[PDB]
Enzyme design. Structure first.
Site, PDB file in Angstrom:
ATOM      1  N   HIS A 224      42.735 108.210 110.574  1.00  0.00           N
ATOM      2  CA  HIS A 224      42.343 106.978 111.268  1.00  0.00           C
ATOM      3  C   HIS A 224      41.124 107.216 112.149  1.00  0.00           C
ATOM      4  O   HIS A 224      40.125 106.486 112.068  1.00  0.00           O
ATOM      5  CB  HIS A 224      43.531 106.443 112.091  1.00  0.00           C
ATOM      6  CG  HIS A 224      43.226 105.212 112.895  1.00  0.00           C
ATOM      7  ND1 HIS A 224      43.698 103.960 112.558  1.00  0.00           N
ATOM      8  CD2 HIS A 224      42.543 105.048 114.061  1.00  0.00           C
ATOM      9  CE1 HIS A 224      43.303 103.079 113.457  1.00  0.00           C
ATOM     10  NE2 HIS A 224      42.600 103.712 114.379  1.00  0.00           N
ATOM     11  N   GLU A 225      41.173 108.261 112.966  1.00  0.00           N
ATOM     12  CA  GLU A 225      40.029 108.586 113.811  1.00  0.00           C
ATOM     13  C   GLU A 225      38.794 108.965 112.994  1.00  0.00           C
ATOM     14  O   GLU A 225      37.668 108.618 113.363  1.00  0.00           O
ATOM     15  CB  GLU A 225      40.414 109.697 114.798  1.00  0.00           C
ATOM     16  CG  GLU A 225      41.516 109.240 115.754  1.00  0.00           C
ATOM     17  CD  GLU A 225      41.076 108.016 116.553  1.00  0.00           C
ATOM     18  OE1 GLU A 225      39.896 107.986 116.965  1.00  0.00           O
ATOM     19  OE2 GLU A 225      41.888 107.081 116.762  1.00  0.00           O
ATOM     20  N   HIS A 228      36.927 105.848 111.796  1.00  0.00           N
ATOM     21  CA  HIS A 228      36.072 105.286 112.833  1.00  0.00           C
ATOM     22  C   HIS A 228      34.798 106.104 112.904  1.00  0.00           C
ATOM     23  O   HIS A 228      33.706 105.546 113.033  1.00  0.00           O
ATOM     24  CB  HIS A 228      36.716 105.369 114.220  1.00  0.00           C
ATOM     25  CG  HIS A 228      37.784 104.361 114.489  1.00  0.00           C
ATOM     26  ND1 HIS A 228      37.583 102.988 114.402  1.00  0.00           N
ATOM     27  CD2 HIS A 228      39.044 104.511 114.954  1.00  0.00           C
ATOM     28  CE1 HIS A 228      38.685 102.364 114.743  1.00  0.00           C
ATOM     29  NE2 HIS A 228      39.595 103.264 115.093  1.00  0.00           N
ATOM     30  N   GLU A 263      39.145  97.870 114.808  1.00  0.00           N
ATOM     31  CA  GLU A 263      40.491  98.397 114.551  1.00  0.00           C
ATOM     32  C   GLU A 263      41.136  97.782 113.308  1.00  0.00           C
ATOM     33  O   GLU A 263      41.746  98.495 112.509  1.00  0.00           O
ATOM     34  CB  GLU A 263      41.403  98.217 115.779  1.00  0.00           C
ATOM     35  CG  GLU A 263      40.965  99.004 117.009  1.00  0.00           C
ATOM     36  CD  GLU A 263      41.021 100.506 116.802  1.00  0.00           C
ATOM     37  OE1 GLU A 263      41.661 100.958 115.829  1.00  0.00           O
ATOM     38  OE2 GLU A 263      40.419 101.238 117.615  1.00  0.00           O
TER      39      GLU A 263
END
Ligand code: NA
Ligand code: NA
Ligand SMILES: [Zn+2]
EC number: 3.4.24.69
Length: 426
Positions: A224-225, A228, A263
């Site tokens: 997930h990070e 980004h 997000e």
């Protein structure tokens, strides 16, 4: 396939000034150099709590109880000893290998390595120059410093071990994350903690129910990070002020809760459909124009500054990064078909929901839920967690039905530190 991290680092390995070195971050003060580990081309790991990146965050001590917010967890001593830092390195390494072992993770990590932040540092529009905040300063065996460009740094958490809510986290380097240029990303992350979620949608999306029966695979959290970071390295992150005033969950709506489009995009699945189709087309046109500005900047470039590297070697690095077309006169341009593919790869293909499918783990079904619990874990022993199976180890009682993520069945692998349910102002 050959591993993503070729050296099995121990924290106590002697510095060599190359891939194990004392380093300083640009714009932090006369900070004492910190010991850091280069795990792959363009990617470093600093097994320290982050007391550097942001000036407003320097003390790890917990606030008074009456100031602490419910979804938060403090432990000022975490990651302060050599053994912990050793385990941290080994844990982060294992998660990069787990990610890289999937085709999706291979694609994402390759995009991350190719995503060199744009050389747009010059004041003079014909000169190509690195931007200084996109490097680190590495101490050499002779005690001198050399500037090294890098794309990604994994660092320990700041005071609040579990970090921000539903908007920002990477942080903003002016408009670099949003103007096509990109900038070096510092991800606060820990492989030693994870959170609990609930397997039934009605329960997981309710702030009043559930204790957090299942544990999130921390490979998904790191993925997930990294998603980004992919958006931010290519300069296409969505400003955190573009938000969804959530009206699809009664509990968010009554509390005026907002979630950033960035997000929702990053989660993917059904969440991404909450990004208003008109705003998304606008975003795409915006980024497409930023890419055109970059092609124009490279076309106008006569000279290069800093570096011994060729004006043409670097022009080609960015031709590759942004998938630009080159005509018969050497002019660069943005190809609409290729922009659409690149933008789609980074925003629709690389999503949390897609990683869940490749890992075959249980996971939250939406970003629009409520956190339940935080657990202490240790993924370093292979009897606990593996590159291939995560917690759901083949040839054990944990292989089927996500039993390894089941914190009631696999209880020796989780220590619950704090419950969040019932704390949400309802
Ligand atoms: Na999912
Ligand atoms: Na337990
Ligand atoms: Zn996020």
């Amino acid at each position: 396939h050959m591993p993503f991290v070729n050296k099995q680092f121990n924290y106590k390995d002697p510095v060599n000034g190359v891939d194990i070195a004392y380093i300083k971050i640009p714009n932090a003060g006369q900070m004492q150099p910190v010991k850091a580990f280069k795990i792959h081309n363009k990617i470093w790991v600093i097994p320290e709590r982050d007391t550097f990146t942001n000036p407003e965050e320097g003390d790890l001590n917990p606030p008074p109880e009456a100031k602490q917010v419910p979804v938060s967890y403090y432990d000022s001593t975490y990651l302060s000893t050599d053994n912990e830092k050793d385990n941290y390195l080994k844990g982060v390494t294992k998660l990069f290998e787990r990610i890289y072992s999937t085709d999706l993770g291979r694609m994402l990590l390759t995009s991350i390595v190719r995503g060199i932040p744009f050389w747009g540092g010059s004041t003079i529009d014909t000169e190509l120059k690195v931007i200084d905040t996109n490097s680190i300063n590495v101490i050499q065996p002779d005690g001198s410093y050399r500037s090294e460009e890098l794309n990604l740094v994994i660092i320990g958490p700041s005071a609040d071990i579990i970090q921000f809510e539903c908007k920002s986290f990477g942080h903003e380097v002016l408009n670099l994350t949003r103007n096509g240029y990109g900038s070096t990303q510092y991800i606060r992350f820990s492989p030693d903690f994870t959170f609990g979620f609930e397997e039934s949608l009605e329960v997981d999306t309710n702030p009043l129910l559930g204790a957090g029966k299942f544990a999130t695979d921390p490979a998904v959290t790191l993925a997930h990070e990294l998603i980004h970071a992919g958006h931010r390295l290519y300069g296409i992150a969505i400003n955190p002020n573009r938000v969804f005033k959530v009206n699809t969950n009664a509990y968010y709506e009554m509390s005026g809760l907002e979630v950033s489009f960035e997000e929702l995009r990053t989660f993917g699945g059904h969440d991404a459909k909450f990004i208003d189709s008109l705003q998304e087309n606008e975003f795409r046109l915006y980024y497409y124009n930023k890419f055109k500005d970059i092609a124009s900047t490279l076309n106008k470039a006569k000279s290069i500054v800093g570096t011994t590297a060729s004006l043409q070697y670097m022009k080609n690095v960015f031709k590759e990064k942004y998938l630009l077309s080159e005509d018969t006169s050497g002019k660069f341009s943005v190809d609409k078909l290729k922009f659409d593919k690149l933008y789609k790869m980074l925003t629709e293909i690389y999503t949390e929901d897609n990683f869940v499918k490749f890992f075959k783990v249980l996971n939250r079904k939406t970003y629009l839920n409520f956190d339940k619990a935080v657990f202490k874990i240790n993924i370093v022993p292979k009897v606990n967690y593996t590159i291939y199976d995560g917690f759901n180890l083949r040839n054990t009682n944990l292989a089927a039905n996500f039993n390894g993520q089941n914190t009631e069945i696999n209880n020796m692998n989780f220590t619950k530190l704090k419950n969040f349910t019932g704390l949400f102002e309802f």
